[PDB]
Design a protein around this ligand. Structure first.
Ligand code: BCL
Ligand code: BCL
Ligand code: BCL
Ligand code: BCL
Ligand code: BCL
Ligand code: BCL
Ligand code: BCL
Ligand code: G2O
Ligand SMILES: CCCCCCCCCCCCCCCCCC(=O)OC[C@H](CO[C@@H]1O[C@H](CO)[C@H](O)[C@H](O)[C@H]1O)OC(=O)CCCCCCCCCCCCCCCCC
Ligand SMILES: CCCCCCCCCCCCCCCC(=O)OC[C@H](COP(=O)(O)OC[C@@H](O)CO)OC(=O)CCCCCCCCCCCCCCC
Ligand code: SF4
Ligand SMILES: [Ca+2]
Lengths: 667, 358, 362
């Protein structure tokens, strides 16, 4: 009746809505519910760690062929060899012990995770009753553990988050000491301050246990004040800690990248190059079209090799396939992308809280420095403008250097590779942080700076212009939803001004500066777009710049080289197809086409209703829903970012192929 | 240690109704400032509208208490109605008992509150006026049968004192404010004028002589005095369409205070203009009075406030900011709310306004 | 163990003037993370005081004060202009005009004022035996002739209410003090030693002025002090007109809030330092009333205030007997931080009057 339809597209409208992906929004969660959710998720984390340990079994000591290699366990196998729970052992006898140890640790993780999940469930339901004693614990005022909960934290459980930092630090000191004693007792590894063995890990676990305990005492008796995070800790403290964890995670990725290449880490990562890996989905022993089983020996349709019966997964060496740095790059890039995403999400959730306090006037009611700074509307403009100017300068300089390098490679306009930026290396005072310092590393540093500033532009726009901007201050407008996609074509268009869309743009902009890491950690010569290509002079880089290594290929030729192995395997090929499929579908929701989709969905609804009557019968009242531009942007950011980083994984997991033999000039 | 536990709840009603359930409990690990300890007290305030024709409401108040092992009791019935905007009349009776002594009283008193100014410039400019100076004029006729020997002795001593001591009018204020009550008088901005006794007499009542005391006094405030600054706000007789009851008490031993209060009464939510209701501005006299006793010990506080809005209503500008919104009920805990709770326990009158609309 | 922290930060700087001058730059920034005791919040205020010497012939100084404030989105303002002079050692005369505006309402005033300060005693035994007399009991006698044009309909209503209230009520003379000191102002009278006497209304007559009716108020009042009040005990020292050889300004302002207070103070005026004998000069004794007035409002949140004080002596001067002792000295300027000084800062923020005197000489 034209109104029954109207309260159908008045159901996805980007007003304030339920938004199923916000059921666990911190606004409706209290402190104890957060504790319980984190405990349950840590229990599930223990469950999946046990699953990974099970996937690490190769002999099943009770007697059976084991699991094939997989990235889920290959990314942690060096750690388990470091802890002595797994082995790089060539013999079944020492591998049965590793299987037994992994099975026992998986069972232990299952038990501990079940306990942790049950505790988190009881915290989630506000049910801290001890079934053995029948009493009930008080979340607001509890003794921590007992006598230990009285000598330190003399009763008086923390009532505020700034008052909870200290007991948390003491809890983390307990964690460090517990891990140290677990090392010392279960895993051997007595604490020796020899910073070249795993014993140093136990020693530094005890050192950090002492440090964290003292710091927790100090912050228990002298709580610090960020002030504002105490009130809306659901979003303020949560987002600040999220961006802090993002920076910590980027730092951890850098630590992993530096450490896993050191000689002290050789028996755990570099020794992966002496192994042979049988990965799921890799090229299997193929057979002809007329295989008739009857094992022991093939009769009709001889397979590729007489060995590896039927459809066995073919071996691949760890030296040609650089599994050492493949695993290193997987771990490092995982933690780097997670850190970048956590920084972006912390800025976004902080902008959410900050718009919430700008809407109710609490923004002017903040006393802490962290907002009294940006409550200026000019220091906001100055900061964003100087970030944009620095991003413009760095990005323009580095991109023009890259384009000139590519021109000199291809000899466009009759140029030559000696006209390129082969001389532009890091300073000798900066050459210590690179191996084989060249224009590639200079370009990497400047591309990292440019991409970080490019994403920082949108991060600053989230931080400052959550509710209003100098443009929207000059106009008679204000932002009051953090998720509204637009106000319309007025002023030529107002698309994507909310902090959610600014988050999406920050993610898309950081895609470049983050994939630049994938090129780098794979050694892919981002200093030019066509490297190693035999066009004019791209193979002369190794001689003109006196390179010591030989990186894979330039930015564009990186999709030709090392894709020879993505295509060579079925699993990586189907991942490539799925990633590209997911990625381009984001155009259906980022392109300014939502109303076209709504109109076409109305047409399809009328068609299906009519097609359900001309041929079928009965009412066809079902109608096609269209994702609104808020939902369209959310789904599009997910589709785009996942589509690109399901294939950055393919670049990372297809091999290293960054040989240390600089090829001679073409001459 | 000396940690302060307290749970507050506000269950509001929507529309024109201003009613709201108020139930709170509090635990304090500090010695109360009572020279007689331990002290226990129970108070029950029940109100029902006698005749909604012209404002009769029957307010009943029973104060049961035990201080240092003596049993105290004070019941008082009162039919209170507003003759006009500024005048109120109360008719009723009551009883006070301490130990084995008990004397029943009946009274017919009228209270006239007058504001010093009624300027429209302030009223139209300040949307939420807190301080509002003025005076009330209490005209009280209280009657007490003189059947006890102690009652007759009190009456004779008072008559002799008024006959002889001419300074009785201002020396009664020393007796009439027991101990720190006199200091609290000035702390809260109150000041009592000298009483004027319009007559003392006795006559043969239903069973014996009765002491009839026609006396008058007036006290004025500088703005904190919530009896004066907000005269009609403290007595919502117009919006009392059903019985209202409040049960409160505390068990205050020598090493702690155990507060318990219930409540169901109108006037919890007042319109603040622009279709925006608010929790009624916090009375200043309780805060400034408790601040003299709430400043004697350093205390940590874990105070939690429930504000259950009606169906569809939403809080806009809660300050200190609420912690967790859950459907239609709100929570305050820690952070600025704990700081504000400590502020108002120690003596501050800082504003914690909860504006809300539908 | 521990308690609630509720930290507060504050910086203070004193830049003294050389020679025999008592001048000195005074600036003080502060930030308190505690709710203020204002029942209407937020309550922001900006204050500007300026004085310039009209003429040294008979000690008139042109003093102006602008108080522009917002409390609960109500833009309040009160500007005054006055010409104040000491015609003798005990009597002060002031003539000037001003205005007050609140939201839409605004009314101007012009006042002829005379304040007479009488100490209850001037015994020489006290003078010759107490080198630093702090308490000094006395009476201030205010005689005010203020004229307000009754142009607004509210001003005429205020006049009609007041003149009808004075003639009909005999208790106006003392009940005026209840309205006069709104809210905590009345309570703060007794906790500072002040006693406000009944005002005598010499007459409320209205006559047509330059533009219309002008309400004229000739009324006197006298407030007494137990020696605890600075406006009485330190009456001579709070009006250094003799030492005002150049314009003096004090620009202050606080940003009160729902969960904090932010304070700025900038000052430049004489009387920052006084003498103590034999070329030994000292920073002026701290005024009693501000300390014991902020005390009854600054004891509601437990706080561990970290305060830094900076005293920049003029060239050739060295501090002798700073108590509490200065934490550091850069050979020309002295710095207070933590230790016993932070204890005194908390003491005076809670209302204590612990003597922190700084003496210096060349
Ligand atoms: C690694 C350990 C996990 C944890 C795992 C569990 C598990 C598992 C259980 C509890 C249980 C309880 N925990 Mg615990 N609990 C954790 C942290 C907390 C915190 C906090 C950080 O503030 C609080 C208030 C509590 C409080 C409670 C009480 C409600 C209850 C019994 C306490 C006890 O026996 O002693 N836990 C730590 C982080 N807790 C027990 C319970 O609820 O019994 C009904 C229960 O089974
Ligand atoms: C909530 C308001 C308190 C607070 C008290 C705590 C407590 C208590 C803890 C953290 C925790 C964290 N805080 Mg915090 N946090 C505050 C102010 C800050 C500031 C700042 C002002 O710049 C920063 C960068 C951080 C950052 C951090 C991360 C370093 C850390 C881990 C977060 C996570 O895993 O979850 N906090 C203020 C002082 N923060 C956790 C941590 O790692 O402690 C060692 C933790 O247990
Ligand atoms: C280093 C660890 C990260 C972290 C990583 C995660 C991850 C990952 C998840 C959560 C999840 C949750 N976290 Mg957490 N979380 C951290 C610190 C916090 C803080 C804080 C500092 O104040 C808060 C309030 C929360 C609150 C929450 C809730 C949104 C949710 C748990 C309840 C649930 O539904 O299940 N986290 C730190 C910063 N948290 C779960 C969730 O649903 O989030 C929507 C989830 O999957
Ligand atoms: C407290 C501050 C002022 C004061 C302000 C008022 C106010 C305001 C009123 C009176 C009123 C009256 N006053 Mg008086 N009055 C004071 C001191 C006195 C003294 C004395 C010996 O000191 C006396 C005898 C009186 C006598 C009287 C009676 C004529 C009358 C109340 C009778 C009644 O209600 O009884 C029953 C006794 C009580 C109910 C005790 C409980 C009192 C407390 C303060 C009520 C708290 C209400 C609680 C916060 C919420 C209530 C919710 C429930 C639904 C009730 N007043 C002090 C100085 N007085 C009332 C009137 O108008 O009479 C015409 C009135 O509205
Ligand atoms: C407004 C006060 C309440 C009241 C509350 C109390 C309380 C509380 C107590 C007593 C107690 C007693 N009551 Mg009684 N009592 C009242 C009315 C009276 C009257 C009377 C003629 O109206 C009389 C003779 C008495 C007599 C007595 C005293 C003999 C006896 C113990 C001494 C004491 O301190 O009393 C207090 C005396 C007064 C507060 C009022 C005295 C009235 C005088 C005789 C007549 C009025 C004089 C003057 C005009 C009123 C001045 C104002 C009053 C100070 C409020 N009450 C009124 C209704 N009464 C004690 C008891 O019950 O058990 C030990 C006690 O603790
Ligand atoms: C504050 C304590 C005493 C008080 C003590 C004094 C003192 C002391 C003096 C007066 C003086 C005056 N008083 Mg008085 N007086 C008080 C209450 C009042 C009230 C009232 C309604 O309450 C009124 C109407 C008056 C009226 C007056 C006028 C008769 C006269 C000049 C007013 C003027 O110039 O403004 C001046 C006011 C300001 C400029 C606003 C700032 C006020 C504060 C106190 C100044 C702080 C100075 C700051 C610490 C340092 C400034 C240094 C810069 C160089 C300026 N007083 C209270 C009770 N009064 C003056 C006089 O003698 O006139 C003959 C004078 O010296
Ligand atoms: C000494 C105080 C300052 C002053 C400062 C303020 C302030 C502050 C405010 C007003 C405000 C108003 N002023 Mg004014 N105002 C003064 C002089 C006057 C005179 C007059 C004949 O002299 C009149 C009619 C008025 C009229 C008015 C009221 C109608 C109006 C709002 C009510 C209010 O609170 O009044 C306040 C009334 C007084 C403080 C003085 C009233 C004077 C009476 C009519 C004549 C003197 C009577 C008596 C002898 C002197 C008593 C001394 C006072 C108690 C201090 N003012 C003097 C100059 N005036 C309000 C406003 O501006 O915007 C809302 C307000 O907040
Ligand atoms: C994968 C590629 C795409 C489709 C498949 C597709 C399908 C589609 N689109 Mg599209 N689209 C883009 C990509 C795709 N758009 C891009 C990149 C842009 C940006 C330029 C874009 C833009 C618009 C605008 C502007 C409008 C539409 C519509 C419109 C609808 C037409 C209805 C119809 O005739 O049926 C045609 C529908 C089909 C043939 C679907 C059959 C399945 C098949 C086997 C492909 C499988 C789907 C997928 C590959 C597998 C995922 C399944 C999952 C389980 C893993 C119809 C559903 C319009 C409407 O909604 O209404 C008319 C409209 O207005 N678009
Ligand atoms: C914002 C401002 C940031 C300024 C900081 C300068 C950036 C420095 C980056 C260059 C450092 C570098 O190349 O490391 C140099 C080191 C080693 O340097 C060379 O690197 C080669 C890689 O082919 C080999 O490892 C060689 O052994 C080694 O010599 O490279 C790393 O392994 C770094 C780890 C990956 C870096 C991740 C950066 C994360 C940034 C995310 C930003 C996304 C947005
Ligand atoms: C007779 C007339 C025709 C009737 C039938 C025609 C309609 C049939 C269409 C059916 C199939 C539709 C074709 C596809 C439709 C298409 O391609 O358009 C994308 C589509 C949005 O479509 P609209 O809602 O605009 O309109 C489609 C309409 O057909 C009905 O909605 O949905 C998405 O945004 C997908 C994201 C869902 C959310 C997923 C987010 C990411 C989750 C994680 C996955 C990635 C992992 C991370 C990697 C980065
Ligand atoms: S194109 Fe889409 S997102 Fe942009 S303003 Fe128009 S409706 Fe909004
Ligand atoms: Ca690779």
């Amino acid at each position: 009746d034209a109104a029954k339809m109207r309260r159908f597209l008045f159901q996805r409208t980007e007003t304030r809505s339920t938004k199923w992906y916000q059921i666990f929004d911190t606004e409706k969660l209290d402190d104890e519910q957060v504790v319980g959710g984190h405990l349950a998720l840590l229990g599930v984390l223990g469950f999946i760690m046990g699953i990974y340990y099970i996937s690490g079994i190769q002999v099943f000591p009770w007697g059976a062929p084991g699991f094939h290699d997989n990235w889920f366990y290959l990314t942690i196998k060096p750690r388990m060899v470091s802890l002595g729970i797994d082995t790089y052992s060539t013999k079944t006898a020492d591998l049965e012990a590793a299987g037994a140890r992994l099975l026992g640790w998986a069972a232990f993780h299952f038990l501990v995770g079940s306990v942790l999940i049950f505790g988190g469930w009881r915290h989630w339901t506000h049910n801290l009753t001890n079934p053995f004693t029948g009493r009930c614990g008080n979340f607001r005022d509890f003794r921590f553990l007992g006598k230990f909960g009285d000598v330190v934290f003399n009763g008086t459980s923390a009532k505020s988050y700034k008052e909870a930092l200290g007991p948390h630090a003491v809890y983390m000191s307990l964690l460090f000491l517990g891990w140290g004693i677990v090392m010392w007792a279960i895993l051997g590894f007595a604490p020796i301050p020899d910073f070249q063995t795993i014993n140093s890990e136990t020693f530094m676990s005890f050192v950090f246990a002492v440090i964290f305990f003292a710091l927790g005492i100090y912050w228990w008796n002298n709580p610090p004040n960020a002030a504002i995070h105490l009130n809306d800790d659901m979003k303020a403290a949560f987002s600040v800690h999220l961006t802090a964890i993002g920076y910590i995670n980027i730092a951890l990725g850098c630590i992993a990248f530096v450490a896993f290449q050191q000689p002290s880490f050789a028996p755990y990562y570099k020794e992966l190059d002496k192994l042979v890996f049988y990965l799921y989905g890799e090229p299997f022993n193929r057979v002809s079209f007329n295989f008739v089983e009857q094992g022991g020996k093939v009769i009709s349709g001889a397979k590729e090799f007489a060995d590896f019966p039927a459809y066995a997964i073919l071996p691949k060496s760890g030296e040609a396939f650089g599994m050492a740095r493949v695993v290193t790059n997987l771990i490092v890039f995982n933690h780097i992308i997670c850190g970048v995403l956590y920084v972006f999400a912390g800025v976004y959730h902080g902008g959410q809280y900050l718009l919430k306090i700008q809407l109710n006037g609490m923004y002017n009611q903040i006393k802490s420095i962290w907002i009294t700074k940006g409550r200026d509307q000019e220091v906001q403009v100055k900061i964003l403008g100087t970030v944009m100017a620095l991003c413009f300068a760095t990005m323009l300089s580095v991109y023009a250097v890259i384009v000139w390098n590519t021109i000199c490679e291809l000899n466009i306009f009759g140029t030559n590779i000696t006209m390129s930026f082969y001389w532009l290396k890091p300073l000798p005072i900066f050459q210590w942080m690179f191996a084989d310092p060249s224009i590639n590393d200079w370009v990497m540093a400047h591309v990292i700076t440019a991409g970080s500033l490019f994403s920082l532009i949108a991060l600053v726009r989230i931080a400052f212009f959550a509710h209003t901007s100098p443009l929207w201050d000059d106009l008679g407008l204000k932002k009051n939803s953090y998720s509204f996609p637009c106000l319309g074509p007025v002023y030529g268009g107002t698309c994507g001004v909310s902090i959610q869309d600014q988050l999406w743009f920050a993610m898309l902009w950081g895609i470049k500066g983050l994939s630049a890491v994938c090129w780098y950690i794979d050694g892919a010569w981002i200093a030019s777009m066509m490297y190693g290509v035999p066009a004019a002079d791209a193979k002369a880089w190794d001689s003109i710049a006196h390179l010591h290594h030989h990186y894979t290929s330039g930015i564009f030729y990186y999709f030709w080289t090392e894709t020879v192995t993505i295509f060579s395997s079925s699993h990586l090929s189907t991942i490539l197809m799925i990633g590209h499929l997911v990625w381009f579908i984001s155009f259906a929701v980022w392109f300014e086409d939502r109303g076209s989709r709504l109109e076409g969905a109305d047409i399809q609804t009328r068609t299906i209703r009519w097609l359900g009557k001309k041929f079928l019968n009965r009412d066809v009242n079902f109608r096609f829903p269209v994702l609104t531009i808020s939902d369209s942007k959310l789904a599009g950011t997910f589709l785009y970012f996942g589509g690109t980083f399901m294939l950055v994984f393919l670049f990372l997991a297809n091999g290293f192929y960054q040989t240390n033999s600089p090829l001679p000039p073409p001459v | 240690v000396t940690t302060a536990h307290s749970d507050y709840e506000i269950v509001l009603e929507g529309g024109s109704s201003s009613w709201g359930k108020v139930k709170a409990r509090a635990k304090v690990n500090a010695p109360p400032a009572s020279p007689l300890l331990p002290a226990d007290c129970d108070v029950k305030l029940n109100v029902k509208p006698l005749d909604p024709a012209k404002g009769f409401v029957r307010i009943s108040a029973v104060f049961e208490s035990i201080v240092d092992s003596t049993k105290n009791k004070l019941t008082i019935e009162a039919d209170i109605a507003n003759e006009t905007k500024e005048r109120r009349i109360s008719v009723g009776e009551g009883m006070v008992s301490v130990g084995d002594f008990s004397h029943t009283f009946s009274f017919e008193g009228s209270v006239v509150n007058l504001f010093y100014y009624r300027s429209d410039a302030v009223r139209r400019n300040v949307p939420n006026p807190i301080y509002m100076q003025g005076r009330q004029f209490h005209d009280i006729l209280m009657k007490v049968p003189l059947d006890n020997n102690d009652l007759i002795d009190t009456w004779e001593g008072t008559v002799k004192a008024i006959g002889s001591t001419g300074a009785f009018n201002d020396w009664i204020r020393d007796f009439w404010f027991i101990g720190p009550a006199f200091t609290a008088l000035n702390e809260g901005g109150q000041r009592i004028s000298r009483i004027e006794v319009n007559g003392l007499n006795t006559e043969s009542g239903p069973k014996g002589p009765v002491g009839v005391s026609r006396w008058r006094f007036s006290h004025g405030g500088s703005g904190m005095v919530d009896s004066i600054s907000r005269w009609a706000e403290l007595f919502p007789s117009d919006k009392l369409n059903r019985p209202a009851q409040v049960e409160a008490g505390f068990r205050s031993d020598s090493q702690g205070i155990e507060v318990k209060v219930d409540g169901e009464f109108p006037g919890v939510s007042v319109d603040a203009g622009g279709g925006l209701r608010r929790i009624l501005n916090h009375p200043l006299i309780p805060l400034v009075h408790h601040g003299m006793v709430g400043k004697f010990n350093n205390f940590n506080v874990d105070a939690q406030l429930k504000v259950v809005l009606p169906k569809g209503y939403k809080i806009r500008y809660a300050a200190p900011q609420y912690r967790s919104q859950n459907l239609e009920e709100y929570r305050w805990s820690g952070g600025a709310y704990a700081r504000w709770v400590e502020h108002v326990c120690k003596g501050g009158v800082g504003q914690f306004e909860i504006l809300y609309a539908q």
